Ligand binder design. Structure first.
Ligand SMILES: [Cl-]
Ligand SMILES: [Cl-]
Ligand SMILES: [Cl-]
Ligand SMILES: [K+]
Ligand SMILES: [K+]
Ligand SMILES: [K+]
Ligand SMILES: [K+]
Ligand SMILES: [K+]
Ligand SMILES: [Mg+2]
Ligand code: NA
Ligand code: NA
Ligand SMILES: [Zn+2]
Lengths: 348, 128, 392, 347, 347, 347
């Protein structure tokens, strides 16, 4: 009754904006921010791009890697913070755009930046239970940081999709186990009326991110009977580079182990696509037998941990779609004026 | 509202019709084959989003909605299968030319103000 | 099947007419047409109208009833005819066929437009394109004709200078037209360096949004002599119409308007003349490129050579032994009130063929006594041709 | 072998009649009562929101299950009125029932089908052996636009279901589930707007009936069943008229569909509509009863279920308030107090 | 030298009693009636606004003046509720009375003193010989914040005054005017917000009474008069209490202040309050009567006037509706219909 | 008998060139510069608003008048961007110059004619002898809608004028004034909206030119004058093209209209436009010079003035900053910093 990933895909838009271009406008030292956050630049979606289009790009690429007929997908789940509608499901738009309709279930997922991995766990259940043959879990966002605030340096756009399956011949990776840590924590939120979120500053750190990320990591390792030495690669949530590395070093992972999963310094924080995207970069590089630790975090508060092993099929599919690193490096820089124009940050 | 719903499979997936009688592929899908009319028998047909620029223009003063995009490239793409479509091209103003190979992409085309629905559909991206 | 003639023509100024309402316009054009034709209001048996502004601009449909009501001609039947920019010519053809049938002897064919009252006019002129497969994706009406110009330049090597000469001529001719919207001379450089609308077209290549009204009185050729001196009567030799794909991308060839070829050929056949005998032509040149294409489709020159016949200026009034195109200034310079354009085109041929003083300063040479008009709806989905002669 | 080990419901105490809304806006109440088949609807207290309703229903489900909430490995809340735009209700419910910390959670969005989407998610996690128990909730504090017809039906309520694997504690067993989904712009809301928009008569045949009826047919084909095999049925119920039309279209009689229909005195509770109707069926059902449940969400999509009741039902029905007891414990209010409570007066 | 040649008033027909607002918000109506000295207030029809009220009042003033509106050389509208943020009410009023095009106009803003500020402007333009007649209007469709105490007094109304130079046409004569103005943040509204904010108990002694009493004492010093020299008086009336406290402080009796007090049955019409009260005085006054009129605006500022009535008053009173008749032609509504009319319901 | 005893102006230090706006929105800057006859515009500091600009202009006017602000009996501020929706700018200005408390005040609204409306009001009060000195201000911090053509011209600035009765103190004398007013919906803004709406090409002939030319023709007919009688002229200047078209239509030459035209390097300061242009004329004019000043406001109306300069002008010009010196002390900014300052970034 093994469960694994039969295909995966990623997408990042082409525009970027450097820390220097945001700091120029607001009167801050860019080097201090770059070092403080461990971030150089972030991605920007085209004004004709949104969470749905980014999810569709990722979904379509994952179908390429899976090499299956999308009609077989029995569930599509989209985890996001920036669903283009307040009340109309992205997941339905994605299912139609990949040809999965009509014989499937779907839902839009909300749980800050963990929404994406919640959908993976949902697909694991439906496939393992035999309720569907394949399920798709997507995590994607076109984050918007509040203009004067520090989150504007990291709030980026991107997404990644994963297709979950039951057939060993088609698995590129296998779930060894999953575990989740969840409490009620008011570190980060947004009220229905407001344009941008609010947060508790230094409360977002130890009592929320590290509490949940680290409890989730040691929980799955206890469930699995493993140590840091047993894993080849790791990926944690990455609101900035600093938090990622602090968590990775706390648990005892070295650079070689955590290097692939960290994209924020040149991608930014894509929220519910953050860990899905880092994981996809690990898979674009991984070899057969590699063991991966993946742990997401969402504010509210909650984390999803995964223990995954790569199979021999990975080589066959990596080049079947664009690689996350290739997407991340085909880029066009823009200045703050064009950035706020694109993002709809100008009062009109 | 209803009119978007009818052409979603065409706008999203480039699914047109092929007349078995003469073989000509049609996109957007047609209810009747103009060459065979009554004797024509149409079937569903999935197009590849691949095509080439047939002609184009650069819109310098569009309606206010497109203010973020202005100036944008608009073109008629000749698809590999035969049909031609009108669509925007996601490329730089100074790199569009007739005969450039392009490929369809799912994008946000239009929005009916801030309260109405969002309409998605095809936009073309160059190959390199 | 009776012969049809024209006994009168009336027109308002074309432009930004703030003072003049929609009512003030139709009346002024109708009264002028009534007065020119030497008929009383009671002599009109029916009316045929073209108009776009009403429904897109004001929310008013049922314009026919409104126009008959406020003209004071109730209970005469009034009918609205629509084909986007070709509504004027279709209203005429509808009127022609009604006289030919014998059901009406004297009929008014008019068109009116009040585009200045709308906040944004583009959405209306874009109505003539396919909303779901052209407009939806951001192809503005100028960009469609711009893509025609691009393809024509690609196939036949038309240069922007050649295209720009069309607009220079139009503006020169329009200074001779009191009713023209623009009465100023321009130069090649001013046209090319003007602000761009849709590559390769500039603001000086595009026709403007215009208010105006025009009206014709058509009549049975024999009854015409009751109101007019036989010499001041112009006969309608042919009133033909054709159709093409509504979308430019569905056209077999974008460099030609098949509906114009089809319609013009049928008119030439019915009149039993060749293009070489046309003395004056009024073509639909809302975007200049369309002027060149129609000069070719009507048979005045070979496909791809229009640019070279404009460069030498053979379409100019002073240039002899070649047809004279748009003596009034055309749509670009004289103005393009969508619904009235098809009517105005013919009224110019009427003035030109009858040597009326209205066109005294722009009078073309008339060797044979024939004129033709081509009115286009949208990018070519509808074309209506009217061929006039001084001989019955 | 997957089933429901416990279930619970909650409805607030305040109600408002059609007569009180029509009075204000100048409409004939009888015409509305007959047109929509609705008499009154529920109203939440100003200190109540989707979260509190979900906790009430969740806590009631725990009573019927008779288990330790620490045993719950996933909590899923489906709604349209999550109190935050970005902060999960599901976490608040898990803390409020003692399920934290060893669990996963997510807030679900898919118009009025969000709640049943969560049931299917729990079915998967339990069936696969990934969790021992999962909770799926559907709850809403719907808001109708003041002048609009949706103000006559937009009500508040919710119901929770705990899914499990142990035959001895199952009160009902899932025979199968099926879902029909397309992209349909019949009903939506944009992030800025206060109230939703819709396509009027497009919400009917091409959206509600297409998906509800294709989903119903679909599961009966999957299971190889006919209408006569089911004792009870419950469909999405935006108004009474749609429910009955669908039920009669499929061939169900009044006795079969009556228990599932709560809108005429409850209103449309959106993602809580079918969960609540199903719970009323369970408060009445006997051993062996077979239920067809089909939800609807605008978007669009429907979730179908084929469920059989067991002998354990009699042990739990009285372990918590019955859905009909909640619905009939009520206090009426007028339109002025209604718009005060609901926050419909601009301040 | 300068006087009023005609004046006019308007009040809409709908009213709402304090009982109907308190019922909804859970307050004692008797305490409010006694605390504020207010029983009910006026409510404009949903098709009525400051412009329409200004037009009604302006047209009535023209009837009383008995002049040709073409001769009016200035139109000034003082309000807090101009129907546009940027488009002058005054222009609409001039067009609606036939005063256009040979005139100047402006919309005036200074809280509830805007109306009387315009009177002083017209006095200047007429006295200087720059115009032959000027019109000053004060009108408002005030909106009180739901749940706040201003909702019991915030009403709609207005009055217009035409100023002239011709003794034969003057119904009253200005003896003098004086104004007291400082920068006082007692009451304000920011451009984004729906309803104003205020300093509560700061609105009283340091603002209303400071300015109303300094303006009154000031003009009496300027005129060399005492309270006894005046037959009638009218002060700003945000509630009945403030009015009577001020009037009694200065030594006025009930007979002197009774006519100017309309708030207990009209509400506070803001920039129309004193203009309306003054008009009720003029509907009752006899030849030779001397009036003290003092307005107040938050900001803050007050405009004081010393006016004497002439024998022409009784020729014109019946040439238009009397303020008391308008005030008593009324239809009552409840809170639901009130918030519907006023646009207080979110959508 | 009525004249200007002092005047003052203020312009903030930041500017933005057409190029920086066009760059962002994808437009040809040269086409705009030529089409509008505009090169750059002024931008206020984020700690600057209409009130601070008005105080600067008022204080400068007091320097030139050389009088004690206590003597000012009226302060009127005309604007479209009063910092508060309900709290008078004029009061803050009166307090900030020491004119309080013995004065009247009001805030004026009438699109871009508000400022000149106050001059006429001061003319009336001074001529009538009701006050000794009055102050009229016109100031704005205009905001153009991002992406729209008004963003190239919407600028910040203001000017103040003190009106008096004493020949020895007059720097200029009013020969006459005239106003043309109708109801015209060319330009407006509703209370909710951030930026105005307009009728595009309806703003030109039927509104600006209709009113500007009728007002200019009107005062010349009232005064018995021709274009040849005036040394200088200044018209409203929403762009350079309208100004010049108007000036040439009436027969004025470049030498006559050159000084009043500031928009090409200042932008359109709305109610401060003509006051500022007039002030530059006065900074250059010589004894005996006769000026035609005609403002315009949407809704719609224009105020015309016929003014003659006196010998006292040279005594005061240097007593405060000259309008050209303010305009040329400048610091350029890019679009990002501009929208930051102006509060155009959603935050
Ligand atoms: Cl379909
Ligand atoms: Cl007649
Ligand atoms: Cl205004
Ligand atoms: K004639
Ligand atoms: K949401
Ligand atoms: K006097
Ligand atoms: K205001
Ligand atoms: K003073
Ligand atoms: Mg006659
Ligand atoms: Na920042
Ligand atoms: Na024309
Ligand atoms: Zn065929």
């Amino acid at each position: 009754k093994d469960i694994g990933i039969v295909g995966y895909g990623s997408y990042i838009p082409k525009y970027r904006i450097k820390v220097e271009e945001i700091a120029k406008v607001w009167g801050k030292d860019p080097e201090a921010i770059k070092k403080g956050l461990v971030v150089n630049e972030k991605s920007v979606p085209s004004p004709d791009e949104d969470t749905a289009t980014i999810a569709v790009e990722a979904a379509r690429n994952a179908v390429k890697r899976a090499g299956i007929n999308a009609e077989k997908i029995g569930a599509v789940y989209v985890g996001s913070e920036s669903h283009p509608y307040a009340v109309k499901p992205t997941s339905a738009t994605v299912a139609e755009a990949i040809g999965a309709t009509p014989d499937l279930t779907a839902a839009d997922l909300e749980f800050a930046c963990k929404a994406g991995t919640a959908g993976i766990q949902m697909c694991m259940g439906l496939v393992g239970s035999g309720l569907i043959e394949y399920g798709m879990a997507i995590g994607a966002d076109t984050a918007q940081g509040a203009p004067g605030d520090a989150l504007e340096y990291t709030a980026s756009a991107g997404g990644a999709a994963y297709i979950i399956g039951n057939k060993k011949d088609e698995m590129i990776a296998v779930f060894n186990g999953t575990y989740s840590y969840t409490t009620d924590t008011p570190d980060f939120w947004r009220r229905e009326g407001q344009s941008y979120p609010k947060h508790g500053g230094r409360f977002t750190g130890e009592p929320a991110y590290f509490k949940h990320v680290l409890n989730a990591a040691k929980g799955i390792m206890e469930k699995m009977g493993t140590t840091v030495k047993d894993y080849d690669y790791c990926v944690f949530h990455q609101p900035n580079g600093k938090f990622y590395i602090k968590a990775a070093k706390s648990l005892g992972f070295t650079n070689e182990q955590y290097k692939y999963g960290l994209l924020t310094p040149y991608l930014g924080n894509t929220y519910s696509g953050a860990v899905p995207l880092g994981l996809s970069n690990i898979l674009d590089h991984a070899e057969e037998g590699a063991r991966i630790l993946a742990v997401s975090y969402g504010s509210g508060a909650g984390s999803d941990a995964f223990d995954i092993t790569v199979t021999e099929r990975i080589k066959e599919v990596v080049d079947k779609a664009p690689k996350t690193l290739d997407l991340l490096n085909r880029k066009k820089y823009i200045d703050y004026a064009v950035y706020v124009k694109y993002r709809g940050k100008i009062k009109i | 509202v209803v009119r978007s719903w009818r052409h979603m499979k065409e706008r999203y997936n480039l699914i047109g019709t092929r007349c078995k009688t003469c073989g000509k592929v049609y996109f957007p899908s047609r209810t009747v084959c103009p060459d065979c009319r009554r004797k024509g028998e149409l079937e569903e047909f999935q197009l590849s989003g691949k095509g080439k620029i047939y002609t184009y223009s650069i819109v310098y003063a569009p309606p206010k909605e497109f203010n973020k995009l202005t100036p944008y490239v608009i073109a008629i793409v000749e698809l590999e299968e035969g049909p031609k479509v009108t669509a925007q091209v996601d490329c730089d103003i100074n790199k569009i030319s007739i005969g450039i190979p392009v490929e369809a992409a799912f994008r946000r085309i239009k929005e009916d103000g801030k309260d109405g629905i969002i309409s998605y559909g095809y936009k073309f991206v160059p190959i390199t | 099947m009776r012969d049809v003639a024209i006994i009168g023509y009336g027109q308002t100024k074309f432009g930004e007419l703030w003072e003049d309402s929609f009512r003030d316009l139709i009346v002024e054009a109708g009264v002028k047409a009534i007065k020119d034709a030497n008929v009383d209001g009671g002599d009109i048996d029916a009316m045929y109208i073209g108009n776009m502004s009403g429904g897109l601009f004001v929310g008013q449909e049922h314009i026919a009833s409104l126009i008959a009501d406020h003209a004071g001609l109730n209970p005469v039947p009034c009918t609205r005819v629509e084909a986007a920019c070709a509504s004027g010519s279709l209203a005429l053809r509808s009127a022609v066929l009604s006289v030919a049938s014998g059901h009406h002897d004297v009929v008014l064919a008019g068109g009116v437009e009040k585009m200045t009252d709308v906040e944004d006019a583009t959405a209306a002129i874009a109505s003539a394109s396919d909303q779901e497969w052209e407009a939806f994706f951001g192809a503005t009406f100028p960009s469609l004709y711009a893509m025609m110009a691009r393809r024509y330049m690609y196939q036949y090597g038309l240069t922007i200078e050649e295209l720009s000469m069309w607009s220079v001529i139009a503006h020169e001719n329009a200074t001779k037209n009191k009713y023209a919207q623009f009465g100023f001379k321009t130069t090649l450089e001013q046209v090319m360096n003007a602000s761009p609308v849709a590559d390769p077209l500039t603001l000086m290549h595009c026709s403007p949004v215009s208010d105006g009204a025009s009206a014709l009185i058509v009549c049975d050729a024999d009854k015409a002599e009751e109101f007019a001196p036989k010499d001041e009567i112009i006969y309608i030799k042919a009133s033909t119409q054709a159709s093409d794909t509504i979308a430019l991308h569905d056209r077999e060839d974008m460099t030609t308007l098949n509906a114009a070829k089809v319609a013009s050929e049928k008119a030439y056949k019915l009149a039993k003349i060749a293009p070489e005998k046309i003395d004056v032509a009024e073509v639909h040149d809302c975007f200049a490129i369309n002027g060149l294409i129609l000069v070719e489709d009507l048979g005045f020159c070979k496909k791809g050579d229009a640019g070279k016949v404009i460069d030498e200026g053979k379409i100019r009034i002073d240039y002899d032994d070649f047809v004279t195109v748009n003596p009034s200034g055309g749509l670009k310079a004289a103005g393009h009130a969508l619904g009235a354009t098809g009517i105005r085109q013919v009224g110019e041929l009427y003035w030109q063929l009858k040597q009326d003083k209205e066109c005294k300063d722009r009078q073309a040479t008339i060797k044979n006594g024939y004129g033709i008009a081509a009115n286009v709806g949208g990018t070519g989905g509808t074309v209506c041709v009217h061929l006039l002669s001084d001989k019955r």
